[PDB]
């Protein structure tokens, strides 16, 4: 009786894996036949064979969903900082406070190369760079540390050390990753999205 009740459920899944293929393949070949000519032009616009405007910007950002880092996002700023913090260590460079970190960041950001992307990404990175500075002041007044740079305890300056040389490479790397995260002009978005709901 237990073997019969166990093999009853085994036939429940064996008849289910035989029928899924039919209507699944039917819905797949019905979904591909409608979305197979949707392409992205060179002016960041998706159109069909006629020339009609489907969407002014694919998704809203013009980014390939495949090349993304973090649940929908271009890249994670904390992880890239955690990487660049240890790959370029040089104790010769001293530390700095937050009120100078903000001015250095906004001075190095106002350059001739950085004025090519969306200012939304710039505000998104300004929200993260500002939040890192609030973490530094609480740790600095945590134990008691003057930022002038002369205090005989030497290890208290190694808790969260941010130097101006490694902060430029972080910005350049994230800005360059945001350049490659953009979807290429000419990709077939219709055929790509048609099969994403297939499997």
């Amino acid at each position: 009786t237990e073997f019969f009740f166990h093999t009853m459920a085994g036939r429940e899944g064996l008849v289910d894996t035989a029928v899924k293929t039919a209507e699944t393949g039917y819905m797949q070949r019905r979904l591909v036949k409608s979305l197979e000519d949707l392409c992205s032009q060179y002016d960041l616009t998706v159109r069909s064979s006629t020339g009609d405007i489907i969407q002014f910007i694919y998704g809203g950002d013009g980014l390939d969903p495949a090349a993304m880092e973090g649940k929908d996002e271009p890249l994670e700023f904390k992880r890239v900082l955690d990487n660049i913090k240890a790959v370029f260590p040089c104790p010769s460079e001293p530390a700095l406070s937050k009120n100078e970190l903000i001015l250095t960041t906004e001075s190095i950001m106002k350059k001739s190369e950085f004025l090519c992307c969306q200012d939304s990404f710039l505000q998104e990175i300004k929200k993260f760079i500002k939040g890192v500075s609030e973490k530094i002041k609480k740790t600095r007044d945590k134990y008691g540390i003057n930022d002038n740079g002369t205090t005989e305890p030497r290890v208290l300056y190694q808790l969260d050390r941010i130097t101006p040389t490694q902060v430029e490479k972080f910005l350049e790397t994230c800005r360059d990753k945001y350049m490659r995260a953009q979807m290429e002009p000419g990709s077939a978005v219709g055929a790509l999205c048609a099969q994403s709901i297939g499997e």
Partner: protein, 49 residues
């Protein structure tokens, strides 16, 4: 032709064509559907097709 008993080839259906379309390659899609399967040279007229 169909079958190995007559020394035939393989079939390239639509689901495998969708994989080549999603990538975006047009040279290979035309090479293994028109150049290697059936390449014919026909003639027509301009006055009346």
């Amino acid at each position: 032709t169909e079958g190995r008993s007559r020394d035939g080839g393989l079939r390239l259906g639509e689901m495998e064509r969708d994989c080549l379309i999603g990538y975006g390659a047009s040279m290979l899609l035309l090479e293994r559907l028109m150049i290697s399967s059936d390449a014919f040279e026909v003639d027509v007229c301009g006055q009346c097709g």
